[PDB]
A paper describes a structure:
We wondered whether the sequence dissimilarity induced structural differences that could account for the different aggregation tendencies of the MDM2 variants and performed protein crystallization for MDM2f and MDM2z. We obtained crystals for MDM2z and MDM2f, which diffracted to 2.87 and 2.27 Å, respectively. The unit cell for the MDM2z crystal contains two molecules of MDM2z, which form a dimer. The overall structure is similar to MDM2h (RMSD of 0.6 Å), where all secondary structure elements and the coordination of zinc ions are conserved. There was no electron density for the first 11 residues (407–417, corresponding to 423–433 in MDM2h), which are located N-terminal to the RING domain and partly involved in the formation of a 310-helix in MDM2h. A possible explanation for this observation could be the sequence difference for residues preceding the RING domain, which form a 310-helix in MDM2h but lack electron density in all MDM2f and MDM2z structures reported in this study. The helices are stabilized by a tight hydrophobic packing arrangement involving residues A434 and F490 of each protomer. In MDM2f and MDM2z, A434 is replaced with serine and cysteine, respectively. Both serine and cysteine would likely cause a steric clash and their polar side chains would disrupt the hydrophobic packing, thereby precluding a similar helical arrangement.
Numbering used by the authors:
A (entry chain BBB), B (entry chain AAA): 418 to 475
The structure:
């Protein structure tokens, strides 16, 4: 799916939720960051967001 | 791009090259890891690979 950020649905999925050595890409960097600041869990696995990487394709 | 890992072209781009708080997604986790172990640079920006995240799209 080339579908947008699942939260805002207005921006691309370029906000990578890192937990250790695995990452989940369902949200934009800006949305995924708000989740971490407001102490929400990863929507994919409900595991704490350790950090957020701004991800660029090619 | 729905195109495969630029190195092996046999696995998806699920190997996120992290440098600071930005990541580059052009290679598979296994290919991007070999780059880090053999002290190669990020093919996108020729900046050192600080870590590699195994990324899952949802
Ligand atoms: Zn968003
Ligand atoms: Zn997760
Ligand atoms: Zn590869
Ligand atoms: Zn790079």
């Amino acid at each position: 799916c080339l579908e947008p950020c699942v939260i805002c649905q207005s921006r691309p999925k370029n906000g990578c939720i890192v937990h250790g050595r695995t990452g989940h890409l369902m949200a934009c960097y800006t949305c995924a960051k708000k989740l971490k600041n407001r102490n929400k869990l990863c929507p994919v696995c409900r595991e704490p967001i350790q950090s957020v990487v701004l991800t660029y394709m090619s």
